[PDB]
Amino acid sequence: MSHYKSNVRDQVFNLFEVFGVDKVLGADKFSDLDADTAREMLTEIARLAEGPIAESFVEGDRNPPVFDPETHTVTLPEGFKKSMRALFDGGWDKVGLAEHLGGIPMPRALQWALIEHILGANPAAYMYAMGPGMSEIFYNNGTDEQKKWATIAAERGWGATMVLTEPDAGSDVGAGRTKAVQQPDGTWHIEGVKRFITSADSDDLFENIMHLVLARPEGAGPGTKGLSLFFVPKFHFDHETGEIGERNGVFVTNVEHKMGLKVSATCELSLGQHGIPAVGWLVGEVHNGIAQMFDVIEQARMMVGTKAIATLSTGYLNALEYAKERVQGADMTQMTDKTAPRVTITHHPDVRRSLMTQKAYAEGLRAIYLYTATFQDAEVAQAVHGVDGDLAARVNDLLLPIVKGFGSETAYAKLTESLQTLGGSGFLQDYPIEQYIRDSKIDSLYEGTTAIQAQDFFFRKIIRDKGQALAYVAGEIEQFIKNENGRLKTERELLATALADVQGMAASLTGYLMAAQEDAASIYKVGLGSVRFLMAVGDLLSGWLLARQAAVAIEKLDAGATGADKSFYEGKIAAASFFAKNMLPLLTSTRQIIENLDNDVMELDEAAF
Amino acid sequence: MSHYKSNVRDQVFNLFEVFGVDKVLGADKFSDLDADTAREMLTEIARLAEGPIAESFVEGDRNPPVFDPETHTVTLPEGFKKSMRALFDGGWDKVGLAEHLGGIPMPRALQWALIEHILGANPAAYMYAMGPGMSEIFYNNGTDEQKKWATIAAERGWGATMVLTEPDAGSDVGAGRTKAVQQPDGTWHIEGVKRFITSADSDDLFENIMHLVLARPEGAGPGTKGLSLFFVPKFHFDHETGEIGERNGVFVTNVEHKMGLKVSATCELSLGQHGIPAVGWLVGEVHNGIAQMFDVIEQARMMVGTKAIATLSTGYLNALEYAKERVQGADMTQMTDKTAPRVTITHHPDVRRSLMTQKAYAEGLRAIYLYTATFQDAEVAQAVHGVDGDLAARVNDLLLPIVKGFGSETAYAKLTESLQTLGGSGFLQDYPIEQYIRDSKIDSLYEGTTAIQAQDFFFRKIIRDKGQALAYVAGEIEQFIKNNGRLKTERELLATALADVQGMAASLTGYLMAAQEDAASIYKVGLGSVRFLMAVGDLLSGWLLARQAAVAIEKLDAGATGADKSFYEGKIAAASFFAKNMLPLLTSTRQIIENLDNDVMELDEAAF
Numbered sequence A: 001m002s003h004y005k006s007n008v009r010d011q012v013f014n015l016f017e018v019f020g021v022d023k024v025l026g027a028d029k030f031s032d033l034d035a036d037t038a039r040e041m042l043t044e045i046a047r048l049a050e051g052p053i054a055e056s057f058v059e060g061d062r063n064p065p066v067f068d069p070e071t072h073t074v075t076l077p078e079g080f081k082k083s084m085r086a087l088f089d090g091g092w093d094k095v096g097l098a099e100h101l102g103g104i105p106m107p108r109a110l111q112w113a114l115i116e117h118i119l120g121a122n123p124a125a126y127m128y129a130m131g132p133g134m135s136e137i138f139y140n141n142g143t144d145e146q147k148k149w150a151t152i153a154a155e156r157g158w159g160a161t162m163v164l165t166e167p168d169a170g171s172d173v174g175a176g177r178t179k180a181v182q183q184p185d186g187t188w189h190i191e192g193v194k195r196f197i198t199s200a201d202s203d204d205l206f207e208n209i210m211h212l213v214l215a216r217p218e219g220a221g222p223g224t225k226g227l228s229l230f231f232v233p234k235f236h237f238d239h240e241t242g243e244i245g246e247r248n249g250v251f252v253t254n255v256e257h258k259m260g261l262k263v264s265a266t267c268e269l270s271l272g273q274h275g276i277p278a279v280g281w282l283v284g285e286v287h288n289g290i291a292q293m294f295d296v297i298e299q300a301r302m303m304v305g306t307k308a309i310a311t312l313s314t315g316y317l318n319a320l321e322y323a324k325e326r327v328q329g330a331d332m333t334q335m336t337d338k339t340a341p342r343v344t345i346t347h348h349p350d351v352r353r354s355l356m357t358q359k360a361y362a363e364g365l366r367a368i369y370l371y372t373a374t375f376q377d378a379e380v381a382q383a384v385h386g387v388d389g390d391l392a393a394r395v396n397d398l399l400l401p402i403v404k405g406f407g408s409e410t411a412y413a414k415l416t417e418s419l420q421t422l423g424g425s426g427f428l429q430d431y432p433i434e435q436y437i438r439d440s441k442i443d444s445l446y447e448g449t450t451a452i453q454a455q456d457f458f459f460r461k462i463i464r465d466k467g468q469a470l471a472y473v474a475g476e477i478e479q480f481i482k483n484e485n486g487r488l489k490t491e492r493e494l495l496a497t498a499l500a501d502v503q504g505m506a507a508s509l510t511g512y513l514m515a516a517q518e519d520a521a522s523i524y525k526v527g528l529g530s531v532r533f534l535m536a537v538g539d540l541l542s543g544w545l546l547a548r549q550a551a552v553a554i555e556k557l558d559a560g561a562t563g564a565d566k567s568f569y570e571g572k573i574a575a576a577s578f579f580a581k582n583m584l585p586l587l588t589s590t591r592q593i594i595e596n597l598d599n600d601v602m603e604l605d606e607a608a609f
Numbered sequence B: 001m002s003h004y005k006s007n008v009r010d011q012v013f014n015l016f017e018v019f020g021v022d023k024v025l026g027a028d029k030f031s032d033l034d035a036d037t038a039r040e041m042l043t044e045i046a047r048l049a050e051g052p053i054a055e056s057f058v059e060g061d062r063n064p065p066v067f068d069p070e071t072h073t074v075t076l077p078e079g080f081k082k083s084m085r086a087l088f089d090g091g092w093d094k095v096g097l098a099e100h101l102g103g104i105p106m107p108r109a110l111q112w113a114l115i116e117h118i119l120g121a122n123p124a125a126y127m128y129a130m131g132p133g134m135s136e137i138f139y140n141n142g143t144d145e146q147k148k149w150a151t152i153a154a155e156r157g158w159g160a161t162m163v164l165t166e167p168d169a170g171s172d173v174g175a176g177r178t179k180a181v182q183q184p185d186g187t188w189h190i191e192g193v194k195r196f197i198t199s200a201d202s203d204d205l206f207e208n209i210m211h212l213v214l215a216r217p218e219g220a221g222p223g224t225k226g227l228s229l230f231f232v233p234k235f236h237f238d239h240e241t242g243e244i245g246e247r248n249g250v251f252v253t254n255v256e257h258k259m260g261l262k263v264s265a266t267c268e269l270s271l272g273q274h275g276i277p278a279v280g281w282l283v284g285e286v287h288n289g290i291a292q293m294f295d296v297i298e299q300a301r302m303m304v305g306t307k308a309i310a311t312l313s314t315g316y317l318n319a320l321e322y323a324k325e326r327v328q329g330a331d332m333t334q335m336t337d338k339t340a341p342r343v344t345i346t347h348h349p350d351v352r353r354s355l356m357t358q359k360a361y362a363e364g365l366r367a368i369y370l371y372t373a374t375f376q377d378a379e380v381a382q383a384v385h386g387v388d389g390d391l392a393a394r395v396n397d398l399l400l401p402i403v404k405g406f407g408s409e410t411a412y413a414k415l416t417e418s419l420q421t422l423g424g425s426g427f428l429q430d431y432p433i434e435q436y437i438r439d440s441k442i443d444s445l446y447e448g449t450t451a452i453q454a455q456d457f458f459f460r461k462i463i464r465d466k467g468q469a470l471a472y473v474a475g476e477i478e479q480f481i482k483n484n485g486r487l488k489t490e491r492e493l494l495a496t497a498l499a500d501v502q503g504m505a506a507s508l509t510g511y512l513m514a515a516q517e518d519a520a521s522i523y524k525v526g527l528g529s530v531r532f533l534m535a536v537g538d539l540l541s542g543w544l545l546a547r548q549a550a551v552a553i554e555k556l557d558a559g560a561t562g563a564d565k566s567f568y569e570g571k572i573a574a575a576s577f578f579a580k581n582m583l584p585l586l587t588s589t590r591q592i593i594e595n596l597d598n599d600v601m602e603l604d605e606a607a608f
């Protein structure tokens, strides 16, 4: 078997027993897709992920890509290219792509449940396959002429990149200095150096790459508002037929040596510096780059959060299988009897504590991203939540920093428990967990650091939104708390305390921000507390959704579930209760810490660190 | 310079301004070592560590050792062996060795401060260099004739190993099946396969290796009580002269591919399986193996804990230096002004929070291992704490699982913050933090997993000790709490944290007492034991940081200026930050421990 251990059963439970995404299946935009077909698609990609995609997971890390300075190209290991061909040959790079581009219409919740498997098995494979989806974004923002090129790009399976970051412009995107110079023929010459560009070359996987490049037109003003977005293809091509023509002046100059995710080629990218111009076309023929890059942003944040949970999930299931088989020590009830039978380590309290921590966070994160995705289709949000399109969009916007920020921080931290369950063997490359950890560290950095996520969440998704999306979610949690089984009373009580705790954090932080008008330095306490607040909201949402799942599991058990279903439902009840009693209470101390924040660390001389 | 960034200034602060190790230097066992020589030694090893030792840190990981299965030997990268020779040429493998073995007598607190630099710069270099310290343990436990061999091994710089683990006996040491077959002439033939043995081969670093092997004499009883310890040399040698002779039957048969610490050869070791007996000599000529291996275990635990803090410390200082230089974004007070000047990232609250978290925990851990080491010499414990040898031994015993268990978990977790400070660059091998992380993940596994540490802490170091060492430490925290207005809030927060930990200890003890009536109650001890150990660590960190701030306030009040002034101000800030931001969480942890239940123990395994 491969390293990759999937959990289709938990995805189906979320999609169909908890959130009810099957209500929209078979009607209107999803007329061509029934629930049975959705279930079969999930089983099928899970098998693909466990087979040919996971097949090259180890090889891509042990035999990583090599930059060739003689040609300014990257060479990828042959086994990974075999995996990519399996993904393309099955049409999986076109799941959730618009029908007019050749895609299969489906709810975003189903789409991300399918992508979870590729991210768990070999996450760089999904990254290299994000071309069609970026072509769709270019389609939606382009002129009528540009839509014709985007159609070509989608149908020919070109690769794509998102090209923002520069040596001195990473978190501060508005500081970019890459330049765009308008030409007499209405094209632009793009000039500058970009850094950390994922998939900037990809060997012979594709016949072209579409680079979407942020750059500052000559004479444009400063900051984010002065940035425009350009379509910059690796090769010139015939704008009617798609025939590949002459090389365009956009070249990789290095491939980074990274801790993990090694088979994803992460490149320094030079535009206009190797003898020929980097010709670009202004997207939509309008100057609106950051706003056009928005749906790319949102996609990248969902991808990172799904990746984090995908990897935690397979890390947990690998640890669990190991623990079931490993014999070590006597039962703690027999510590004093040195004739006692040896037991499998799932009999040890600390190991069960570790495994339940891993399980609860893995399942809680899965529920979070699928919950989030039910707000990404107007149809689904109306059907499953009764929410209209504007509020659904604002709730999605609120949740994405949680999916990304909380997910990225939690998965890496809980994989520590996964490795620990194997004992010394977890430190070995023979088992996949050490690579999961290395591959997962990037999650807190890619598409904006955790602190940027947490600042965006508070300043933009709460304060600027005047709290409307947050109020909606809080009201859903309160409705669950106030609904009247007795087997979930203590969970509901712990959730009520956690809800009050997060509300108190929000109010303290909001006070610090509003007081900044009188005392400017007050705002620093918002920065000091932002990440802890984001993580507290993640824990609340986790606990609430686990409890919701436990409520469905109780109904299903009372209705007579048996066998492997019964075991699944009992595990949901156990994980919800464990999380409520062991993770949620810590938010009370965090609330008090945030209520007691001060400016001393800001006033300290830098020379004192 | 190199990746390794040292902090001698903090070590000297602890040693001489907080704990008063100065008081024993220049008298009795330490007659010919004064405080000025100790400071020079710290500066010297730190410079060696930053230079020749750290020089091969990257090479060891990127060009890791290669095993030849037909010769049963490993080849180490040349630059790493050059680092080892720099260590041997300066006599640093004999730090704290007994004078009669060629060492320089010193307090253990100074010894581990010296060693911290090697562990920060290239931790596998110290690990390969642990021979002489293991020779002294063999000397102390040996017959008169074995003491002669230990003297040879120490003086010649032989390597050494501790050989316990087998494929089916890791946490459960007592399950070991390796056997010892007594020969007519009183030697033994050892037969079995051990796994995960550090330094079981080491290329040509040493003339010989002393393997100290746990094995079960034929016919002995089960469990740890049936195990004996054997001196098993790689090469036979002339017992009078030390001249190395013919190969003994102990051969490496595999070298593991690990996440980190790659240059430390971690080996499958086969005894008696290749047609050649693995001859062993019963240590002390008595059957008492687990007790003999104990002094080895305590050294290992101190080592792991000191390695954890050494690595976090250099990880923090690398992050700090990066943050001082990296310009990104506007000041938060100028968020709306698109013309605002860009600032260095140390201006951002989240970076300052991150850096203070890294600083407070690195410095708290350093104080913990130095504090612990002040109980490892009777005369230091007498002069600095006023405690006798018996109590001192029991306090050292209590603290070592904290050094090991709390340190190992803390350093790896807080290095996540060090990497984050660099942003995307932190994910690059061009900077040393990702290797710090990979190298540190072993700390929670080497010499016993965290769960084993925490179970040892509670059952053996508290319950079996009847709480005597724990009550001593608690009484010292309480005397600090009860003793000027500027540390009032810190003292209040420490008093809460002390009560929280005392409440957790009472809850777990109660669960153990209830197991007299309902055996399953014991499982609650297991469920909570690691959280309890981590809570005691946070409490000790907070207390020791606050004691450091008290001294820092005295030195500022007296008129400190310049870099000293900045150093002391940081000590005050770290102690305050830690009390307000780390300690209050123990209150929720106490409540969680009070509410533990057996639901997770009763769940069907199939339901996970």
Ligand SMILES: Cc1cc2nc3c(=O)[nH]c(=O)nc-3n(C[C@H](O)[C@H](O)[C@H](O)COP(=O)(O)OP(=O)(O)OC[C@H]3O[C@@H](n4cnc5c(N)ncnc54)[C@H](O)[C@@H]3O)c2cc1C
Binding pocket: A326, A328, A329, A330, A345, A348, A349, A350, A351, A420, A421, A422, A423, A424, A425, A427, B161, B162, B163, B164, B165, B167, B169, B170, B171, B172, B195, B196, B197, B198, B199, B266, B442, B445, B446, B447, B448, B449, B450, B451, B452
């Ligand atoms: C890099 C490295 C170097 C090493 N060097 C040496 C060396 O030089 N010499 C040497 O002798 N050994 C050495 N070891 C062995 C190391 O001490 C063992 O890995 C460790 O003791 C755990 O044993 P194990 O790997 O068999 O894990 P296991 O004991 O199988 O543990 C698996 C899991 O079960 C849990 N578990 C097991 N028993 C219990 C219990 N009773 N209660 C609760 N939880 C339990 C563990 O905490 C862990 O999470 C080394 C290991 C490593 C990783």
Ligand SMILES: Cc1cc2nc3c(=O)[nH]c(=O)nc-3n(C[C@H](O)[C@H](O)[C@H](O)COP(=O)(O)OP(=O)(O)OC[C@H]3O[C@@H](n4cnc5c(N)ncnc54)[C@H](O)[C@@H]3O)c2cc1C
Binding pocket: A161, A162, A163, A164, A165, A167, A169, A170, A171, A172, A195, A196, A197, A198, A199, A258, A266, A442, A445, A446, A447, A448, A449, A450, A451, A452, B326, B328, B329, B330, B345, B348, B349, B350, B351, B420, B421, B422, B423, B424, B425, B427
């Ligand atoms: C593997 C990898 C692949 C990537 N792929 C791409 C890609 O395809 N396309 C692309 O455009 N980019 C890509 N990036 C860049 C990515 O989006 C990040 O934004 C970038 O790495 C973060 O900026 P930086 O590395 O310059 O760090 P910095 O911005 O220098 O941040 C360093 C530290 O300062 C903190 N900080 C900075 N500003 C603030 C602030 N205002 N408030 C608080 N703290 C702050 C950060 O949180 C961090 O702790 C990639 C990065 C990596 C690691």
